């Protein structure tokens, strides 16, 4: 209440407090609490393998050069006295780019505690790289991390914990893809070895499941009705060149520029995916259905009744093969 | 453990630092050793010739006037503490974008040793330039560069070396491209001449191999589908003028707008690649193909079956020297 | 989850070749490493190989005498000991490292541990 006692509290705490020096220097690490509050994750790229996350980063740890007698409340202090203290050197190992929200003030918290316990907490976002296995793709599960890291402190000088062990980590209800379900997130703790020493690592990863429906309707939908199409020519008189060339020609050209199309969605993968081996079934049926008038044209200067009933129950076993194995 | 004394020692250090000043200036040079551990190398742009490389960087060298006594320990520092201490003006000559990573601090390390040995840690970013020879494109081979120079010291008062010779850089196990494989990574180092004196060097190159996987899916396989798709031609009837006309037109502007399409994708150089080698073999025989055609008209108001055996025997031809060549 | 059998150790006094085969979700650990543990002495890397790529690293001390590479295909890893001494006499272990594990030298930052062959000659 006393703003001039207050006043004279805080002063005390910084005056000839060093910046430079963790707490506890040359003693036991300093342990600091972490834990994460999902606000967002915006965007998934395939193209550039990486996810843009918005989130609330809290650390804890104490500082007994900050510790304060006779006011039993907790000091919330304005943001900018972090510039005043010691913080942790964190950083995200994986991080592509990041930074501090700054409207109307930089979005930082400072909560100080009668022992000395600090509370640092920041808003960030962050585009993390996330490397795919698109060999599935699109009925692929994939694995994005966030990988926490001390810069500069070793394990001797520094220990990073999550606050709370499994609900350090709040918000994963919030996560709305349009194309991803979230199955699971996970916590870990451990320690990484460099050349520069022993460094405390947390690691936070998400499971992503992606959504079939927009492809169904995007790519495959268009395939197979062009496929059934196809078919349609072995219903036409074989005196009819121009008709049936016309349905082979089109419908080849058209599976041509759907598969280009949709690589130029991608990134320049040398390995096939799934969407590509549908699209390459599809293409050589419709392919096999011009050739088969250039067969009967071929002999006629039978095999239409023949191609009636093989090629639909051939295209039927292929796409049973082909969703048995990828769902 | 006495951070009083530790801070007393640090105060000692930094009372009357000039920060102008190299260590040993007027001296013999200085000798900054360089470490280099890479993160990743996110994106290779045809288009803008350049790359984007994430690394650690990391300078060593001695500085006397941070020398200190009584303390057996490698004093890591908050990295504030970099902008009261002289550091080496070092810049890439070939980066076209660059930035320390800030958050949730700068990415940036300090740690003193009892001798003055000073160990200076950075984070980057760095899109560089890498001038590309797309002659043999898309089977090529790329050498990218990275060159490091000391921007306003002379070799009259910095020298760098790579600190461990041939295990100064670290991580190229990490890249994974999709679309290359690290064939080799080399170190040199060498003095650069220019008209403000001589300057120390080091460079880290990479040597850049392309995937064919990609490229035999996206642009080589239409291509060779299209061809064949012409010859269809040669077994429909001559009095078929709609259907065996339509073929050859459609296959001929689908191979323009392969080509077109292609082009678009990368920079506008002035010389023919080796795609562009495929392509117009391939567009030749497709317009021979219509061509065929028309002399076959010409003289109906034999060539055919000729036709069904040279074409489809000179397109092996064809493939046969092209993928010798260049493969 | 990664699972790791090595084989082709055993006894000789001479060109040999060990063999190490992963199955599982391997494309979360890009890189198998080879690794030796005399007795008495601490685990010792001898090299790593990145599956995608075949970036090859090795320690200076089989520089030039050991050689590693794999088959995607089968999902094996080779190490093709040739040139064999009596240092090179420990148990050989087989070992995966995550994509953001660490540096390849040190055994603590690899998760899933082969068996091990003991080679003696």
């Known amino acids: 209440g006393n703003m001039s006692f207050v006043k004279e509290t805080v002063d005390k705490l910084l005056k000839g407090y060093d910046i430079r020096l963790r707490p506890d220097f040359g003693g036991p690490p300093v342990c600091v609490g972490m834990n994460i509050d999902i606000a967002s994750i915006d965007m998934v790229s395939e193209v550039n393998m990486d996810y843009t996350l918005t989130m609330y980063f809290q650390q804890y740890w104490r500082d007994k050069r900050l510790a304060y007698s006779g006011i039993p409340l907790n000091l919330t202090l304005d943001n900018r006295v972090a510039d005043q203290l010691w913080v942790p050197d964190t950083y995200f190992l994986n991080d592509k780019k990041s930074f501090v929200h700054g409207v109307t003030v930089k979005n930082r918290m400072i909560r100080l505690h009668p022992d000395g316990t600090v509370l640092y907490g920041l808003r960030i976002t962050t585009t993390a790289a996330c490397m795919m296995d698109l060999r599935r793709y699109p009925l692929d599960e994939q694995n994005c991390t966030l990988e926490i890291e001390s810069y500069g402190y070793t394990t001797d000088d520094i220990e990073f914990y999550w606050r709370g062990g499994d609900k350090a980590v709040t918000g994963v209800e919030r996560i709305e893809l349009p194309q991803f379900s979230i199955v699971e997130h996970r916590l870990v703790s451990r320690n990484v070895v460099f050349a520069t020493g022993a460094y405390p690592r947390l690691s936070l990863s998400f499971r992503l499941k992606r959504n079939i429906g927009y492809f169904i309707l995007q790519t495959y939908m268009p395939s197979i009705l062009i496929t059934i199409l196809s078919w349609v020519s072995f219903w036409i008189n074989y005196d009819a060149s121009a008709a049936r060339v016309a349905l082979g020609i089109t419908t080849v050209l058209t599976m041509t520029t759907i598969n280009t199309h949709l690589r130029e969605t991608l990134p320049k993968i040398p390995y096939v995916k799934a969407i590509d081996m549908y699209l390459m079934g599809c293409f050589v049926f419709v392919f096999l259905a011009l050739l088969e008038y250039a067969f009967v044209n071929y002999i006629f200067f039978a095999i239409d009744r023949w191609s009636r009933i093989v090629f639909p129950f051939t295209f039927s076993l292929f796409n049973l093969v082909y969703w048995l194995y990828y769902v | 453990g006495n951070m009083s004394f530790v801070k007393e020692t640090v105060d000692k250090l930094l009372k009357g630092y000039d920060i102008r000043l190299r260590p040993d200036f007027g001296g013999p040079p200085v000798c900054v050793g360089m470490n280099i551990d890479i993160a990743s190398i996110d994106m290779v742009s045809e288009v803008n010739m350049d790359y984007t490389l994430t690394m650690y960087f990391q300078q060593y060298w001695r500085d006397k006037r941070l020398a200190y006594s009584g303390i057996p320990l490698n004093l890591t520092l908050d990295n504030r503490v970099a902008d009261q201490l002289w550091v080496p003006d070092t810049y890439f000559l070939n980066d076209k974008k660059s930035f320390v990573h800030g958050v949730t601090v700068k990415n940036r390390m300090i740690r003193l040793h009892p001798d003055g040995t000073v160990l200076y840690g950075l984070r980057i970013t760095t899109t560089a330039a890498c001038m590309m020879d797309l002659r043999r494109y898309p089977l090529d081979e790329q050498n990218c560069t990275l060159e490091i120079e000391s921007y306003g010291y002379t070799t009259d008062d910095i020298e760098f070396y790579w600190r461990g010779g041939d295990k100064a850089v670290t991580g190229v196990e990490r890249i994974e491209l999709p679309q290359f494989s690290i064939v080799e990574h080399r170190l040199v180092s060498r003095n650069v001449v220019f008209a403000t004196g001589a300057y120390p060097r080091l460079s880290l190159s990479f040597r850049l191999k392309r995937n064919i996987g990609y490229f035999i899916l996206q642009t080589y396989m239409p291509s060779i589908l299209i061809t064949i798709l012409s010859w269809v031609s040669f077994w429909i009837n001559y009095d078929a003028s709609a259907a065996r006309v339509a073929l050859g037109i459609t296959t001929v502007l689908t191979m323009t707008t392969i080509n077109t399409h292609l082009r678009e994708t990368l920079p506008k150089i002035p010389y023919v690649k080796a795609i562009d080698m495929y392509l117009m073999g391939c567009f030749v025989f497709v317009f021979l193909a219509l061509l065929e055609y028309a002399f076959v008209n010409y003289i109906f108001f034999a060539i055919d079956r000729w036709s069904r055996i040279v074409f489809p025997f000179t397109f092996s031809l064809f493939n046969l020297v092209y993928w010798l060549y260049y493969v | 989850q990664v699972q790791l059998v090595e084989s082709g150790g055993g006894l000789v006094q001479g060109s040999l070749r060990l063999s190490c085969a992963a199955s599982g979700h391997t494309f979360n650990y890009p890189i198998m490493g080879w690794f030796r543990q005399a007795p008495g002495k601490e685990r010792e890397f001898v090299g790593a190989?990145?599956?995608?790529?075949?970036?090859?690293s090795y320690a200076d001390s089989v520089k030039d005498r050991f050689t590693i590479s794999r088959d995607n295909a089968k999902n094996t890893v080779y190490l093709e000991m040739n040139n064999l001494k009596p240092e090179d006499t420990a148990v050989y272990y087989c070992?995966?490292?995550?994509?953001?594990?660490?540096?390849?030298?040190?055994?603590?930052?690899?998760?899933?541990w082969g068996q091990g062959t003991q080679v003696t000659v």
């Open positions: 070992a995966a490292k995550g994509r953001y594990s660490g540096g390849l030298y040190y055994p603590t930052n690899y998760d899933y």
């Open positions: 190989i990145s599956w995608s790529g075949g970036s090859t």
